[PDB]
Amino acid sequence: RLEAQSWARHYQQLAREEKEAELADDMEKGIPQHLFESLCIDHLQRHGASKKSITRAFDDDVEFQERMAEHIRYMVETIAHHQVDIDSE
Amino acid sequence: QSWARHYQQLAREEKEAELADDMEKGIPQHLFESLCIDHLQRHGASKKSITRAFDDDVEFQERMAEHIRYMVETIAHHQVDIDSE
């Protein structure tokens, strides 16, 4: 019994993650980087950032674009997590 | 190394850091939430899931603040360069 339940708990845990990972793949397409570039265009200029500085980071700087894509993923995986919890409630 | 160049370097670093500080206030988290609300409801993200993440998830908020900081420091870094023009 205690081995049959650890198994059931495992299965449910794994199905939850799959649901989440798949949910996170859908949402990720909802927030492409250009939205973040626009955000910076709309808000950082009045603070001293030229359009060029923003353009350099978003269109030219390679790491920035990667650390940016990486945070988007984290954001969507996280919101996916809470979306699942919500379904489970 | 000359004193002129040493200070120039030093000053540039402070300017860059004060620029980044100014930019951080130009991008509060609620702007990122709105963004999520305007583009994720269509991909399966409910208003409640976004809210939970932005208001109730401590780590989420902190990593959000971390990335935002990195964003402005990097953009500030490139702006100072451009100031060399």
Side-chain angles (χ1 to χ4, degrees):
Chain A
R1 286 184 175 179
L2 61 73
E3 213 166 306
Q5 51 179 295
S6 60
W7 187 97
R9 295 158 177 167
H10 190 208
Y11 184 18
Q12 190 174 175
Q13 171 199 172
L14 275 45
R16 191 187 209 295
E17 297 168 352
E18 172 188 53
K19 184 177 297 188
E20 271 181 31
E22 293 195 358
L23 185 60
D25 294 333
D26 301 358
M27 292 180 269
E28 194 183 9
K29 300 305 79 184
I31 36 185
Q33 276 180 53
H34 74 67
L35 291 168
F36 291 84
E37 173 161 12
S38 290
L39 197 70
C40 292
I41 288 177
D42 295 350
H43 298 96
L44 299 178
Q45 286 188 279
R46 61 182 60 228
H47 291 280
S50 66
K51 194 173 178 69
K52 296 182 292 187
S53 61
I54 297 170
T55 286
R56 184 168 293 190
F58 282 95
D59 296 331
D60 301 351
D61 180 339
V62 179
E63 190 189 5
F64 177 91
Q65 298 180 63
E66 290 174 353
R67 284 193 60 175
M68 187 67 231
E70 285 162 50
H71 185 62
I72 305 184
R73 181 67 192 184
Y74 167 73
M75 293 179 64
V76 172
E77 293 180 323
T78 310
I79 295 183
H81 171 49
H82 300 100
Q83 180 44 260
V84 180
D85 281 351
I86 295 177
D87 298 329
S88 306
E89 299 169 1
Chain B
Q1 181 190 185
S2 71
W3 296 3
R5 186 156 72 168
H6 183 203
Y7 171 96
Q8 187 176 189
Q9 167 189 60
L10 262 38
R12 177 253 182 60
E13 278 166 40
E14 180 185 60
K15 307 178 196 306
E16 174 166 336
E18 286 186 0
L19 175 58
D21 286 335
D22 282 353
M23 291 185 289
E24 201 181 19
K25 291 189 173 187
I27 301 152
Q29 298 193 210
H30 73 71
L31 290 178
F32 290 93
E33 176 170 37
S34 288
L35 199 57
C36 287
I37 284 173
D38 287 351
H39 301 73
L40 292 177
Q41 296 191 184
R42 177 178 174 296
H43 297 76
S46 63
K47 270 180 177 287
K48 291 56 59 189
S49 58
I50 299 178
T51 291
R52 206 114 99 185
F54 277 94
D55 298 332
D56 303 336
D57 191 322
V58 184
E59 182 181 355
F60 183 88
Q61 307 185 324
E62 292 177 353
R63 294 196 56 181
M64 203 59 226
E66 275 177 50
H67 188 64
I68 293 173
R69 184 63 198 191
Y70 164 73
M71 279 175 80
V72 290
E73 300 191 320
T74 309
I75 291 171
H77 179 63
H78 287 127
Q79 177 48 244
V80 183
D81 291 4
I82 299 171
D83 285 330
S84 290
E85 308 158 1

